[PDB]
Amino acid sequence: SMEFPFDVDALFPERITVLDQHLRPPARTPARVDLQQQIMTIIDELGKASAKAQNLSAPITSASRMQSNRHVVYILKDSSGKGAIIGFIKVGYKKLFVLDDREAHNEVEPLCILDFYIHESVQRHGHGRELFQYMLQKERVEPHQLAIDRPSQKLLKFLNKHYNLETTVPQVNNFVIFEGFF
Numbered sequence: 001s002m003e004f005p006f007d008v009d010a011l012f013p014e015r016i017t018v019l020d021q022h023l024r025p026p027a028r029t030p031a032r033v034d035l036q037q038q039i040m041t042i043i044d045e046l047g048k049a050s051a052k053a054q055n056l057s058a059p060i061t062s063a064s065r066m067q068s069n070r071h072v073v074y075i076l077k078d079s080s081g082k083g084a085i086i087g088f089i090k091v092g093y094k095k096l097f098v099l100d101d102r103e104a105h106n107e108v109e110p111l112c113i114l115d116f117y118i119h120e121s122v123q124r125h126g127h128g129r130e131l132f133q134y135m136l137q138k139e140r141v142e143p144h145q146l147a148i149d150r151p152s153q154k155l156l157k158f159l160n161k162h163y164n165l166e167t168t169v170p171q172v173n174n175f176v177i178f179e180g181f182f
């Protein structure tokens with residue numbers, strides 16, 4: 001997994017840390033601003049890593065952009081010194097126009113899966129599921145109520161395997177939604 005020039009276990013005492021625009025250092029140290037800089041560095045690097053893996057020319061996730069856009073990120077640390085980071089999922093509500101099965105446009109504002117990444121060295125070990133499930137439970141949203149931003153084939157296979165999400169409603173934007181969404 002991905003390691004950092006500082007102590008991740010101390011920064012993130014919980015296995016899954018939930019952060020929003022205020023980037024609050026979790027309850028216990030270095031000064032608060034220094035801990036926030038650590039968190040920024042982690043999000044910046046997670047976003048970079050997710051970006052390469054997706055053939056992205058630019059990351060969709062960074063510390064500054066998460067703050068400005070008021071997204072929420074769930075970061076999973078490694079349980080296997082100084083700790084390391086396994087991956088993350090980034091979510092947010094977006095106002096969308098979405099097509100239904102009747103090819104009719106609909107104004108909706110669902111919870112969106114905006115970025116999702118698990119370190120390559122530890123994929124297909126069930127970490128993505130654990131993280132996704134945690135997010136669902138915290139957000140109080142059902143999987144079929146989600147919109148997915150530009151999913152990979154991997155993520156589509158994932159959503160089928162773990163949540164029986166298979167049948168999609170064809171869109172012209174770059175979001176995917178499932179039967180059940182409406």
Ligand SMILES: CC(C)(COP(=O)(O)OP(=O)(O)OC[C@H]1O[C@@H](n2cnc3c(N)ncnc32)[C@H](O)[C@@H]1OP(=O)(O)O)[C@@H](O)C(=O)NCCC(=O)NCCS
Pocket residue numbers: 050053054115116117118119122123124125126127128129130149150151152153154155157158159161
């Ligand atoms: C998508 C991702 C978050 C899944 O997390 P994960 O920790 O690998 O997932 P889990 O181990 O909980 O679930 C594994 C399931 O995901 C799917 N999956 C994961 N890696 C896969 C691969 N290389 N090929 C095909 N399916 C894959 C499969 O359904 C797999 O089940 P299987 O092993 O029974 O085939 C992770 O693979 C990833 O980071 N991918 C790279 C970037 C990306 O595409 N994600 C962003 C979506 S746009």
